[PDB]
Amino acid sequence: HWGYGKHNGPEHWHKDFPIAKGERQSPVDIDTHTAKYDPSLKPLSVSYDQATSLRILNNGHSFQVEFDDSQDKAVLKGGPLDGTYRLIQFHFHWGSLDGQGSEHTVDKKKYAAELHLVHWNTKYGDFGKAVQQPDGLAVLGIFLKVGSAKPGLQKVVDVLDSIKTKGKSADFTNFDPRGLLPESLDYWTYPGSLTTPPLLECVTWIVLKEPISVSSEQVLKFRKLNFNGEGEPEELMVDNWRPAQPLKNRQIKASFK
Ligand SMILES: CC(=O)/N=c1\sc(S(N)(=O)=O)nn1C
Ligand SMILES: [Zn+2]
């Protein structure tokens, strides 16, 4: 099975998922001096006031918080998007050390972690259909840097002990994802892919310029999770990030000058 270890990590994925060597793979390095300002780009519209969180799960590759996406409760619109995209879950990627952990890089700089807010395009009716379309998903990427604690993240950090191993889940209601956003919504955007298998090239990536800061104690907690299931030999959940992929025939656009 695929993973992030030496024998089943990102450089092995292409044997089971040949699109790994595809034309619009993610993540990528964002070169700030060659990104193109596009003033036709609209401001992002984030409407999370009615979000309904349900559950948090250790999926063996990360942990994810799931939302009710049965109606237009929490949606993303605007930006480079046409149409409305519903939030279905968020998850993180992080490192073993503070100098690594993000998937995207900015002028080759890595961040300590990267938050992904995953949304799907409601014109396709459900998530499984949306991933088969080039404009099926929109993922909001937010960088984490180590510094001062983020209050809005503590409720997440506090329940990780209850989902330590693969396949564990816990009730996680009334979580407000607005507490995870930076102050500014300026962004870069490019067409790309899911960054874990099946690596489908169905994503409009929206990567926020401004990182959020978390404390060392907060990220430490991330690092105490386990890839393994209960009763199995312990393998700490760290470095669950894919390296930057070739940009190839793509342009990164910026919403800001
Ligand atoms: C949200 C979901 O069900 N899946 C995902 S989201 C994703 S990511 N990391 O956001 O590009 N990769 N995969 C496989
Ligand atoms: Zn992700």
Side-chain angles (χ1 to χ4, degrees):
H1 225 359
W2 67 271
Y4 293 92
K6 329 161 275 249
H7 314 289
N8 60 356
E11 44 282 284
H12 288 273
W13 293 355
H14 66 101
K15 288 173 276 167
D16 284 293
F17 308 94
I19 198 197
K21 297 196 183 238
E23 297 291 300
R24 74 177 253 193
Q25 289 289 290
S26 296
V28 301
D29 176 55
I30 292 149
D31 185 312
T32 60
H33 285 112
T34 90
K36 171 99 181 150
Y37 173 65
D38 183 346
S40 79
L41 278 171
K42 310 244 153 313
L44 282 179
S45 173
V46 184
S47 283
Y48 285 168
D49 60 289
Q50 287 327 114
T52 291
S53 64
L54 292 171
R55 189 175 75 138
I56 183 163
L57 167 74
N58 180 336
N59 62 38
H61 294 100
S62 181
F63 66 89
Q64 59 192 47
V65 166
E66 298 158 350
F67 290 81
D68 173 13
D69 64 344
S70 72
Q71 333 172 42
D72 285 358
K73 268 190 160 97
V75 307
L76 183 61
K77 306 172 355 85
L81 298 179
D82 271 274
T84 118
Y85 289 67
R86 293 182 195 163
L87 173 69
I88 172 173
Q89 58 141 273
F90 70 78
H91 63 268
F92 297 84
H93 305 258
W94 61 89
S96 47
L97 308 164
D98 297 346
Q100 70 197 54
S102 69
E103 295 212 297
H104 288 90
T105 57
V106 180
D107 297 326
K108 308 279 220 257
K109 181 198 194 322
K110 297 169 169 73
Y111 285 93
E114 191 170 323
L115 160 60
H116 290 162
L117 295 127
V118 181
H119 312 68
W120 59 272
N121 187 340
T122 62
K123 72 207 241 163
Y124 295 121
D126 65 77
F127 183 88
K129 299 284 186 331
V131 304
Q132 303 197 213
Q133 309 291 342
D135 57 348
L137 300 201
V139 181
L140 199 54
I142 298 174
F143 294 123
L144 280 64
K145 60 178 194 62
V146 184
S148 311
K150 191 84 154 147
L153 180 63
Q154 196 59 32
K155 283 150 33 59
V156 176
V157 162
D158 271 341
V159 302
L160 292 183
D161 296 326
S162 83
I163 60 154
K164 174 144 124 116
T165 52
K166 172 238 89 236
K168 281 282 95 174
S169 72
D171 301 316
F172 196 68
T173 53
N174 301 111
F175 181 79
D176 178 354
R178 286 181 299 186
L180 304 171
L181 302 175
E183 154 195 329
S184 156
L185 293 188
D186 287 343
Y187 62 92
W188 294 287
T189 183
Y190 75 98
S193 80
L194 301 170
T195 64
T196 78
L199 305 163
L200 303 172
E201 303 177 329
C202 61
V203 180
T204 298
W205 277 100
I206 302 169
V207 179
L208 301 188
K209 177 177 71 189
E210 176 188 337
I212 55 161
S213 102
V214 305
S215 69
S216 73
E217 292 99 326
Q218 282 176 329
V219 171
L220 258 320
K221 306 250 169 145
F222 280 13
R223 296 183 180 136
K224 273 149 100 136
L225 286 165
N226 278 182
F227 283 124
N228 55 282
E230 184 173 25
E232 279 168 12
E234 190 167 11
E235 257 302 303
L236 303 175
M237 190 176 279
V238 291
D239 293 317
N240 53 352
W241 51 276
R242 186 192 197 194
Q245 305 302 305
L247 193 54
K248 285 167 158 135
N249 194 276
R250 288 178 289 178
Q251 196 98 77
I252 294 152
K253 300 202 247 144
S255 78
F256 62 97
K257 153 164 241 188

